[PDB]
Amino acid sequence: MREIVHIQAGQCGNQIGAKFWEVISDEHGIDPSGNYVGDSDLQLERISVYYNEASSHKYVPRAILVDLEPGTMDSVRSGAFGHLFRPDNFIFGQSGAGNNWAKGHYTEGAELVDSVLDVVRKECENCDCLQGFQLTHSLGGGTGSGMGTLLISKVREEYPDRIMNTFSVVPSPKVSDTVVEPYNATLSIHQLVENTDETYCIDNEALYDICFRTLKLATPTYGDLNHLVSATMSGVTTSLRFPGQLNADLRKLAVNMVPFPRLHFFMPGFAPLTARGSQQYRALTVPELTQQMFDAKNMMAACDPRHGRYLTVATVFRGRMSMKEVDEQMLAIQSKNSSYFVEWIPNNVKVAVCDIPPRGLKMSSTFIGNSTAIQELFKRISEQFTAMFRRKAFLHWYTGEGMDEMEFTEAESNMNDLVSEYQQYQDAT
Amino acid sequence: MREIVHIQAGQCGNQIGAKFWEVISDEHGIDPSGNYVGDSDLQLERISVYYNEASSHKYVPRAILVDLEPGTMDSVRSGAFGHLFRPDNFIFGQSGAGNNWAKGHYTEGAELVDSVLDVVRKECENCDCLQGFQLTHSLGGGTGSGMGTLLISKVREEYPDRIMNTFSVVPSPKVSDTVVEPYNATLSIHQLVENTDETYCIDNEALYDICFRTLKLATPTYGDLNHLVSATMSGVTTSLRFPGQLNADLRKLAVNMVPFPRLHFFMPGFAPLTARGSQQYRALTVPELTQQMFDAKNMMAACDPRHGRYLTVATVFRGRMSMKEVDEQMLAIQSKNSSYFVEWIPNNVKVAVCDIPPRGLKMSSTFIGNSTAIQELFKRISEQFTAMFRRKAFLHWYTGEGMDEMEFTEAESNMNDLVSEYQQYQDAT
Amino acid sequence: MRECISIHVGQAGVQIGNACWELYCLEHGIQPDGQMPHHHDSFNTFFSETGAGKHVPRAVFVDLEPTVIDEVRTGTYRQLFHPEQLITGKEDAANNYARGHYTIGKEIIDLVLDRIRKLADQCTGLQGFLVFHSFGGGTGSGFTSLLMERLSVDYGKKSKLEFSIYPAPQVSTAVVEPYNSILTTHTTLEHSDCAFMVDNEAIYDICRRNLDIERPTYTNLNRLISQIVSSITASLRFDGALNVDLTEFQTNLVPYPRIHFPLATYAPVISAEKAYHEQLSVAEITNACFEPANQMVKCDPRHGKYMACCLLYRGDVVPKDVNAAIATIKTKRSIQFVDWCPTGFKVGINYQPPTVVPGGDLAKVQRAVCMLSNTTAIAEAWARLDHKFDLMYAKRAFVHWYVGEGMEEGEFSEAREDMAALEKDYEEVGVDSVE
Amino acid sequence: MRECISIHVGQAGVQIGNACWELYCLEHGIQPDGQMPHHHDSFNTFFSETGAGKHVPRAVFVDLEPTVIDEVRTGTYRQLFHPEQLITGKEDAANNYARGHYTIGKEIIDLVLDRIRKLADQCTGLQGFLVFHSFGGGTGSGFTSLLMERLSVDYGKKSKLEFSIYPAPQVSTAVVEPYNSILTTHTTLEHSDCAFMVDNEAIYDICRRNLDIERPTYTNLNRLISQIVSSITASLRFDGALNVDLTEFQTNLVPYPRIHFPLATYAPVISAEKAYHEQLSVAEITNACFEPANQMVKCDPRHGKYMACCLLYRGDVVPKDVNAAIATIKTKRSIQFVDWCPTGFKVGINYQPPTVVPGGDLAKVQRAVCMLSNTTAIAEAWARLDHKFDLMYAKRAFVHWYVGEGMEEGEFSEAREDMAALEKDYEEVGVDSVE
Ligand SMILES: Nc1nc2c(ncn2[C@@H]2O[C@H](COP(=O)(O)OP(=O)(O)OP(=O)(O)O)[C@@H](O)[C@H]2O)c(=O)[nH]1
Ligand SMILES: Nc1nc2c(ncn2[C@@H]2O[C@H](COP(=O)(O)OP(=O)(O)OP(=O)(O)O)[C@@H](O)[C@H]2O)c(=O)[nH]1
Ligand SMILES: Nc1nc2c(ncn2[C@@H]2O[C@H](COP(=O)(O)OP(=O)(O)O)[C@@H](O)[C@H]2O)c(=O)[nH]1
Ligand SMILES: Nc1nc2c(ncn2[C@@H]2O[C@H](COP(=O)(O)OP(=O)(O)O)[C@@H](O)[C@H]2O)c(=O)[nH]1
Ligand SMILES: [Mg+2]
Ligand SMILES: [Mg+2]
């Protein structure tokens, strides 16, 4: 019940999804062939929320992998944990978006979106009581951004009741992996604030810094970062994929973390994060995790929370623990950081507790903070956009697909409206 | 309870600390891996005052090792009893203070002090009921002196209630291991008389003489001297790390030995000190230790007490003994040396008694004398300073970091004020 | 022959019920499968029986998220429950009162009422209802408001007892607790016969300080509340020197129709290692019950006035000692009843000692006393909620979920007005009379 | 049925209590775990009893440094004490009166008073209090002053006996003894019913000279003082030919409200090897008690006047011999009472012989006598303290700790004035009357 459907757009989306399904299968004890070899019945008590039991007692992910080029698709397909996806789900195009959002949302995407929606509809009808959708994508690449926004708009048209999650890799503040990413980012944010229930802003820069500083890895391959983000998502869903002393679902998180329709952007965080040697030299206590999850150096969004206020906060633990301990820790952390919280929201911490650790560990924790600091991000992007739009650089590439200047004008206006609202609620009284 | 945090600044500080933790672990029966293999429950009844119980039943020192160069840090880390420190505590810089105090307190130290304070704060929050801090450093080297003074000022800002101990290696009267040590010594003394609860003046010259004459060692390596000082510190803390017929703590010693805020400089001493062969040829009686601890040839500060008066005296014994014996010995020693004590402080001996010997022995003793003789030391230094400041030698090295002449003027004025006060109380009536 | 069904709504309700039915099965020597290897019938009031030696509870487990109910179905108490009693929804209200009262619960409420009516008609001397529900969760508040309205419509004058979980002043696991709490209180204020205030914060404090367990699990709090409820119904379920029914509870502890919010307290609560070194005097345990630190709601009773008290004793108890202890309590100054109620006590005595659950945390005691006390300090607690509500309403935060899920803003204004009126009535009672 | 609680403050108090309760358990044949395999009830006055054969002491162990209390919890007398009686602080006052009376003790005093009130209300014929505390230590002086003030506020007219440890004239383990002693005396002077002066220096001398133990441990002095206190309370705890209560002690030994500082003395004290070669005549042991070398305060009694004496005998004692010995004592010249008190004796006789602790140092004797004597020589001792205080105040030494920890200089001046006034009153009593 509460079946969840997974969508993966863009190269980053597909890679993250591959690592994610690896992690999920490892949690549920699922062989690479797709059949179960696990040991605990609770694995299969809710295997149906993410998997479908194909006949002859096999399991397939309920995912939909989308692309405009066969490269990364085939790369995943050849790799292990690839031969379990149902092959009909691999929808891909040939032209390639060329890292352009206009192609990914007007010209190229408009031709595959129909087949994608058909597969979506088939999967929806297969499910018993649909819970919602989770989209894994970037915001810079043309395919991910454009096609994901298109699919989100279409789905929200076809499902104004279900829940929607997006795991977008926001561009880093310092570096810029592409050149035209401000345009795609602005348009994608426009569509997201239009029709998304919640958005999980994530930066590669913060992941780099976490892997280097905290985990003491000077050689972080993209597999590691995707490994971390997938662990985060799995921790998000484990509250319903497994029993718990205080269970939660996606709907509860949306209710608790979104006081206003537009202000649904969240910075995540994970704990504990220990090196290979520096692990046994620390006590794995709930206060330790709690204090770990509250600092700049462990936020997966490159923005110091101290610059703003924590509008809302959610926290999902795992494994056996004592509830009173968690309550006391949350109380202390809310007391000591009094200046860092919204005044008119008392007791702004949502708590969920699971019974299963994510394997290997005794107790883990996931943090989902909706703060006012993230506005800086948008501010930054907005400024850049204006610059690149004042000289109308690269404007012809997007113009040639039917888009016009007024599109960018409206998107920038909308972004500045959102920034104004965020600042307004930051200094509310 | 009463958890104590250890700070080690400078090369001397780090070496002394390494020997110290070796001694402490030997007392508590702690394997080099950091796990307990001891035999007496009393070892672990108060293991928490100096150690933290990391998960999987291990123990880590509650120390913070600080430096501006990786050399001695790495040397210790490679050595045995190094693999038990929690690696995150090893804070070190790259520039190196260059044996300059200005670098160690204005330019170079100002960049690491923040991270050091962060680790300090984390450890403080880990502790249940903090007792106080002990700083292990020198006064000649730039790093030790400067950074220790900086940290002391910062901590006293953040903790105007806790207790503070400093184990400073004062420059020897005759030899001078460096050239510019008068400047660093003067500035360090300035900051110490500003914001230190108690300071344990120690000289390498006196340790040389004790090792040579008393212990009959013509080949004293620095390991031996560090072992002696570490034994002294361990004897200081054993009064609370173990039960006792008349227990004492750091706070009691501070109360008893510091009649006036500035006059908190103490010369320590230890007993018994016997050669390897000349040990069995002497009776280990409380009167013997008592008479041993009162003479010039067993003071760890190079100053004959007969030149001044014993303002106050503290004495901490160990092992099983008879209290009446100690009382009679203290009475006799105070009677026979009537000219050597302050008139207006009757019965100026504080006594503490432990139940555990420092291992290997039946009964030991530690002496902490606050006398007026030590003023000579300062006098000496002051004179030297004036000389080196009259010609303004080396003045440019300290000037180039922002320091000015008025700094030295004020520090020397303060030192002479302290000397005047010490002499005034010496000949009080 | 005096039956009383049990209703468990929401996750808190179901877990509390798990603990309570474990305790009951232990009380009457009943296996998890309904078999059994001073007692009267006794268990008939809460257990129905079939032809064989198999007994089933008179309980209803309703929830909108199948997780916890599935755990029950897989729990060691699997064979116990009649499978039809385990009503499971599909999507939980997700801490949203509107969903739990207008959208989702509205579509299974009829089946729930059907099972209720079946179990009622199968019984003969039905005393009343026992509702076990939290206050913040969407299912709890919403479904409970709906259920109370339906029951009051159907079963007009029968006992309806509630066990809410008052949200703690500082430990709030949810974020929208004030909204759901205000709505559910404004609704239930006109249907509930008698509530029973309990909070998790106070239970944490009690578990740490008295039982000397620093790190408690929800199971422990559930055990405590189960002990309380067992003490409440022991009079019905056992022979005592002075028995008492739920009708007597509602009559005695409710002076005014709106003010029916008594808080709970229990004693003795000491560790088994500390079981010795104290003889557990009846006056001693009475004083323990009256101590502000042993109460199960974070409200200083010295800030209010005990409008009514109900002390229920079980075990080796003798009436004269109870009388003496109560007189001594009345002598003390800091316990100032309302002037217009000079008789501030109803007493109940039972012969059956409380039973300690093996694998539990408490110690086998020969005597026990549960105090249900309706005081005036509770008013202050409402104020706190009031405050929070205003805040979350001064910025219209989170409103859109409730609006779009079948509710109007004027309803929120009306609920605030009703809570303010209740606080006003509490103050009005708090005053003293002239002449 | 005549209860009297025990209160142990500070390290000295706790160790003395260890010895005293060892002695009591030996007296009544009580195991360390409270079990037991002329006697009346007897032990009821100091032991309370639960349902089982387990008895607990009516004692309170309070300290600010958990070391010694933890040793007690680990001591062989672990099962004895009710765990709530072992109140432990976190940071000791560290020989600082200000900390022990304003900063630290102020924050556990309420819990201590709570436990005191619990134990008081559980008892019926409470005679009074027994305080065991040193004089120099910060916890002792500070917490004791606070406790006496609180008790006098709460329990107005009940017996309050104290056992201070008078700091020796020459053996001073601390350095700041005069400050704490002056402060605690200036405070307690208006609350304490009756103190009991004892010093370690005199006990050292007695142990060396009489018991012929050259190297004594604190355990030995504790055994001696425990024997004294057991002799003090044997009248309550046993049947005697002429019994006496603590009220009689305070009435007889306190002529003037301020002058209530009697010093202790005990006999016989001889080694077991020296147990023979002396028949221990009652007159002989009386003379032993009156010898200046057997007193437990380093003050030559021939320098003062015995304002009152109280001799308590236990064992095979016959009243006529006591009368004869007392008459002979009155005949002697060097014992010159005040002219205005011609009756300088109260006597107490008990049948229970003193019990020697196995593993002890004393010898089993058939008779024993404890003398509590209020004399005038004690005044001189105050002078010594006075002197020292002035010195440590003439230079304002050590003042900053006390100032910065919640005290003012005028308070020190006031304490000095009060001590001077007490010495003046002692001199005024020392004079003889005209007409
Ligand atoms: N005392 C106690 N309270 C519990 C326990 N388990 C859950 N709760 C309460 O349950 C609340 C969590 O929300 P719930 O009321 O359970 O919500 P729900 O019952 O799952 O219904 P929905 O809100 O629709 O999901 C917390 O505020 C707790 O107070 C328990 O074991 N003991
Ligand atoms: N007669 C006797 N006196 C003791 C014994 N143990 C400690 N003392 C007294 O205790 C004094 C030491 O200071 P304390 O009064 O114990 O201080 P404390 O009780 O630890 O309280 P703080 O000062 O706050 O640490 C000494 O002067 C001794 O006279 C004992 O075993 N027998
Ligand atoms: N965190 C993370 N980000 C990735 C990974 N691979 C690609 N990206 C991001 O994805 C963006 C490229 O988008 P892409 O999907 O390749 O282009 P598209 O085909 O137009 O959608 C870059 O900004 C990368 O930062 C990955 O493995 N991990
Ligand atoms: N007693 C003792 N003193 C030492 C030891 N090592 C270094 N020192 C002293 O430390 C001083 C050097 O300071 P150092 O820490 O090396 O320089 P810094 O890096 O600027 O702090 C010298 O005066 C030495 O006398 C040691 O092992 N024992
Ligand atoms: Mg629910
Ligand atoms: Mg003490």
Task: For residue C434, give the DSSP letter.
Answer: P
Ligand 4 centre to CA of B402 (Å) is: 25
Quote the minimal CA–CA distance from C97 to chain A in Å: 11
**How far is the C-alpha of C107 from the C-alpha of B188, rounded, in Å?**
78
Task: Mark whether D417 is an active-site residue.
Answer: no
DSSP β-ladder status, B51-54 and B58-61: antiparallel
Q: In sequence order, which residues have a C-beta less than 8 Å from that of residue D68 and are 6 or more positions away?
A: B243, B247, D11, D14, D15
Sign, CA torsion C388/C389/C394/C400 = positive
Q: Three-state SS for A310? A: strand
Task: Give the distance from CA A147 to its chain's centroid.
Answer: 16
- Report the DSSP beta bridge partners of residue B418: none
Q: Which two tokens stand for residue D212?
A: 């012929």
Burial C288-298 (b: 16+ CB within 10 A, else e): bbbeeebbbbb
In terms of C-beta density within 10 A (0-12 exposed, 13-18 middle, 19 or more buried), how is residue D89 classed?
A: buried
Ligand 2 centre to CA of B354 (Å) is: 14
- D7, D8, D9, D11: residue to mutate for ligand 2 pocket, most atoms within 8 A of CB: D11
Verify cis geometry, omega within 30 degrees of 0, for the bond prior to B272. yes
Ligand 2 centre to CA of B366 (Å) is: 20
Burial D90-112 (b: 16+ CB within 10 A, else e): ebbbbbbbbbbbbebbeebbeeb
- Asked if A242 and A359 count as a contact pair (C-beta separation under 8 A), the reply is no
- Asked if A207 and A175 count as a contact pair (C-beta separation under 8 A), the reply is no
Nearest to B246 by CA among D360, D132, D14, D99: D14
**How far is the C-alpha of A208 from the C-alpha of A177, rounded, in Å?**
14
**How far is the C-alpha of A331 from the C-alpha of A245, rounded, in Å?**
19
- Asked if A240 and A49 count as a contact pair (C-beta separation under 8 A), the reply is yes
Give the number of the atom of ligand 3 that is nearest the alpha carbon of residue A147. Answer: 21
Contact D50 C278 (CB under 8 A): yes
Task: Give the distance from CA D145 to its chain's centroid.
Answer: 15
Q: In sequence order, which residues have a C-beta less than 8 Å from that of residue B420 and are 6 or more positions away?
A: none
Which residues belong to CATH 1.10.287.600 in chain B?
375-427
**How far is the C-alpha of C176 from the C-alpha of D364, rounded, in Å?**
77
Chain D interface includes C281 (CB < 8 A): yes
- Report the DSSP beta bridge partners of residue B352: B316
**How far is the C-alpha of D129 from the C-alpha of D120, rounded, in Å?**
10
**How far is the C-alpha of B264 from the C-alpha of D373, rounded, in Å?**
45
- Asked if C306 and C344 count as a contact pair (C-beta separation under 8 A), the reply is yes
Largest Cα–Cα separation, chain C: 66
On chain A, the residues whose CB falls within 8 A of the CB of C94 are 249, 251-252, 254-255
Alpha helices in B159-312 (DSSP H): 181-195, 204-209, 222-241, 250-257, 286-292
Task: Give the distance from CA D288 to its chain's centroid.
Answer: 21
- Report the DSSP beta bridge partners of residue A64: A7
* Closest Cβ opposite residue D94 in set B1, B255, B345: B255
Q: Which two tokens stand for residue D266?
A: 């005990």
C-beta of B10 in contact with ligand 4 (< 6 A)? yes
Nearest to A268 by CA among A232, A304, A319: A232
C-beta of D354 in contact with ligand 2 (< 6 A)? no
Q: In sequence order, which residues have a C-beta less than 8 Å from that of residue C360 and are 6 or more positions away?
A: C223
Nearest to A149 by CA among A17, A7, A300, A6: A7
Nearest to C207 by CA among C223, C187, C193, C190: C223
Verify cis geometry, omega within 30 degrees of 0, for the bond prior to A87. no
Cα torsion A229, A234, A239, A240 to 10°: value is 140
**How far is the C-alpha of A296 from the C-alpha of A269, rounded, in Å?**
10
- Asked if B272 and B291 count as a contact pair (C-beta separation under 8 A), the reply is no
DSSP β-ladder status, A310-317 and A365-371: antiparallel
Contact D122 C281 (CB under 8 A): yes
Burial C58-68 (b: 16+ CB within 10 A, else e): bbbbbbbbbbb
Q: D29 among the known binding-site residues? A: no
The subunits that touch chain D, with at least 3 C-beta pairs less than 8 Å apart, are B, C
Q: Under CATH, which architecture does the A3-257 domain have?
A: 3-Layer(aba) Sandwich (3.40)
Cα torsion D291, D294, D298, D299 to 10°: value is -20
Q: In sequence order, which residues have a C-beta less than 8 Å from that of residue B332 and are 6 or more positions away?
A: none
Radius of gyration of chain C (CA): 21
Task: For residue B341, give the DSSP letter.
Answer: B
Q: If one looks up domain A375-427 in CATH, what number appears?
A: 1.10.287.600
Verify cis geometry, omega within 30 degrees of 0, for the bond prior to B70. no
Which residues of C have a catalytic role annotated? 248
**How far is the C-alpha of B342 from the C-alpha of B428, rounded, in Å?**
8
Quote the minimal CA–CA distance from D24 to chain C in Å: 18
Looking from the CA of C139 toward its CB, the CA atoms found within 13 Å total 27
- Asked if C155 and C187 count as a contact pair (C-beta separation under 8 A), the reply is no
- DSSP line for D221-258: HHHHHHHHHHHHHHHHHS--SB---HHHHHHHH-SSSS
Nearest to D371 by CA among D328, D312, D330, D325: D312
Q: Strands of D128-132's sheet, edge to edge?
A: D86-88, D59-63, D4-9, D128-132, D159-163
**How far is the C-alpha of B308 from the C-alpha of B372, rounded, in Å?**
5
- Report the DSSP beta bridge partners of residue B368: B268, B314
| Secondary structure element (H or E) that encloses residue B52, with its range | strand B51-54
- Report the DSSP beta bridge partners of residue A4: A132
On chain A, the residues whose CB falls within 8 A of the CB of C11 are 246-247
Q: Three-state SS for A100? A: coil
Cβ atoms within 10 Å of B259's Cβ, excluding its own: 25
**Ligand 1: which residue has its CA nearest to atom 16?**
C11
Tokens 């933790």 identify what position? B21
Q: Which two tokens stand for residue A321?
A: 């623990």
SS (H, E, C) B92-139: ECCCCCCCCHHHHHHHCHHHHHHHHHHHHHHHHHHCCCEEEEEEEEEC
Q: Three-state SS for A262? A: coil
Please state the φ and ψ torsions of residue D6, each to the nearest 5 degrees.
Answer: -120, 140
Cα torsion D204, D207, D213, D217 to 10°: value is -50
Please say whether the structural domain A265-374 has been given the CATH code 3.30.1330.20. yes
The resolution in Å comes to 3.6
- Asked if A353 and A323 count as a contact pair (C-beta separation under 8 A), the reply is yes
**How far is the C-alpha of A73 from the C-alpha of A86, rounded, in Å?**
13
- Asked if B424 and B342 count as a contact pair (C-beta separation under 8 A), the reply is no
Q: Which two tokens stand for residue A22?
A: 């690896």
In terms of C-beta density within 10 A (0-12 exposed, 13-18 middle, 19 or more buried), how is residue C56 classed?
A: middle
Q: Which two tokens stand for residue A373?
A: 């600091």
CATH of C263-379, one of 3.30.1330.20, 3.40.50.300, 3.40.50.620, 2.40.70.10: 3.30.1330.20
Residue type, C302: R
**How far is the C-alpha of C270 from the C-alpha of C276, rounded, in Å?**
10
C-beta of B8 in contact with ligand 4 (< 6 A)? no
On chain D, the residues whose CB falls within 8 A of the CB of C287 are 121
Per-residue CA distances from C354 to B379, C34, C368, D39 (Å): 80, 21, 7, 39
Q: Three-state SS for C295? A: strand
Which listed ligand is nearest to B206 at the C-alpha? Answer: 4
Q: Three-state SS for A64? A: strand
Quote the minimal CA–CA distance from B158 to chain D in Å: 18
**How far is the C-alpha of C137 from the C-alpha of A246, rounded, in Å?**
11
- Report the DSSP beta bridge partners of residue D295: D265
**How far is the C-alpha of C75 from the C-alpha of D273, rounded, in Å?**
74
Task: Give the distance from CA D265 to its chain's centroid.
Answer: 11
Please state the φ and ψ torsions of residue C255, each to the nearest 5 degrees.
Answer: -70, -45
Which residues belong to CATH 3.40.50.1440 in chain C?
3-253
**How far is the C-alpha of C285 from the C-alpha of C370, rounded, in Å?**
10
Task: For residue B199, give the DSSP letter.
Answer: E
Chain B interface includes D173 (CB < 8 A): yes
Ligand 2 centre to CA of D13 (Å) is: 7
C-beta of B267 in contact with ligand 4 (< 6 A)? no
Nearest to D423 by CA among D194, D252, D162, D185: D185
| Secondary structure element (H or E) that encloses residue A63, with its range | strand A63-67
Alpha helices in D210-343 (DSSP H): 218-237, 246-253, 282-290, 319-331
Give the number of the atom of ligand 4 that is nearest the alpha carbon of residue B100. Answer: 20
On chain C, the residues whose CB falls within 8 A of the CB of A259 are 395, 397-398
Which residues belong to CATH 3.30.1330.20 in chain B?
265-374
Phi-psi region of A215 (alpha: psi -120 to 50; beta: other; left: phi over 0): alpha
- Asked if C301 and C197 count as a contact pair (C-beta separation under 8 A), the reply is no
Cβ atoms within 10 Å of A312's Cβ, excluding its own: 24
**How far is the C-alpha of B371 from the C-alpha of B303, rounded, in Å?**
10
Q: In sequence order, which residues have a C-beta less than 8 Å from that of residue D399 and are 6 or more positions away?
A: D393, D409, D412
**How far is the C-alpha of C345 from the C-alpha of C330, rounded, in Å?**
10
Method: cryo-EM
Contact D397 B245 (CB under 8 A): no
Cβ atoms within 10 Å of D256's Cβ, excluding its own: 11
* Closest Cβ opposite residue B245 in set D90, D218, D397: D218
DSSP β-ladder status, D86-88 and D128-132: unpaired
Verify cis geometry, omega within 30 degrees of 0, for the bond prior to A220. no
Q: Which two tokens stand for residue D430?
A: 């020392």
**How far is the C-alpha of C345 from the C-alpha of C367, rounded, in Å?**
19
- Asked if D131 and D229 count as a contact pair (C-beta separation under 8 A), the reply is no
Phi-psi region of B98 (alpha: psi -120 to 50; beta: other; left: phi over 0): left
Q: In sequence order, which residues have a C-beta less than 8 Å from that of residue B156 and are 6 or more positions away?
A: B164, B195
| Secondary structure element (H or E) that encloses residue C362, with its range | none
Nearest to D39 by CA among D344, D259, D325, D353: D353
- Asked if B298 and B371 count as a contact pair (C-beta separation under 8 A), the reply is no
C-beta of B61 in contact with ligand 4 (< 6 A)? no
On chain A, the residues whose CB falls within 8 A of the CB of C211 are none
Q: In sequence order, which residues have a C-beta less than 8 Å from that of residue D328 and are 6 or more positions away?
A: D283
End-to-end CA distance of chain A: 43
Ligand 5 centre to CA of A163 (Å) is: 17
Chain breaks in chain C (C to N over 2.5 A) after: 37, 40
Contact D91 B255 (CB under 8 A): no
C-beta of C351 in contact with ligand 1 (< 6 A)? no
Please state the φ and ψ torsions of residue C405, each to the nearest 5 degrees.
Answer: -105, 25
End-to-end CA distance of chain C: 48
Nearest to C91 by CA among C79, C103, C109: C103
DSSP β-ladder status, A63-67 and C4-9: unpaired
* Closest Cβ opposite residue A284 in set B55, B60, B87: B55
Radius of gyration of chain D (CA): 21
Please state the φ and ψ torsions of residue C48, each to the nearest 5 degrees.
Answer: -90, 160
C-beta of B305 in contact with ligand 4 (< 6 A)? no
- Asked if C94 and A252 count as a contact pair (C-beta separation under 8 A), the reply is yes
On chain C, the residues whose CB falls within 8 A of the CB of D52 are 276
Task: For residue B212, give the DSSP letter.
Answer: I
- Asked if A142 and A103 count as a contact pair (C-beta separation under 8 A), the reply is yes
- C11, C64, C141, C219: residue to mutate for ligand 1 pocket, most atoms within 8 A of CB: C11
C-beta of C89 in contact with ligand 1 (< 6 A)? no
Q: Which two tokens stand for residue A123?
A: 């999967």
- Asked if B99 and B180 count as a contact pair (C-beta separation under 8 A), the reply is yes
| Secondary structure element (H or E) that encloses residue C370, with its range | strand C367-374
Q: Do chains C and B touch (3 or more CB pairs under 8 A)?
A: no
Residue type, A179: V
**How far is the C-alpha of D64 from the C-alpha of C246, rounded, in Å?**
50
Radius of gyration of chain A (CA): 21
Sign, CA torsion B193/B196/B198/B202 = negative
Q: Name the fold adopted by D3-253.
A: Rossmann fold (3.40.50)
Q: Three-state SS for B414? A: helix
Which residues belong to CATH 3.30.1330.20 in chain C?
263-379
Nearest to C63 by CA among C110, C127, C133: C133
Q: Three-state SS for B56? A: coil
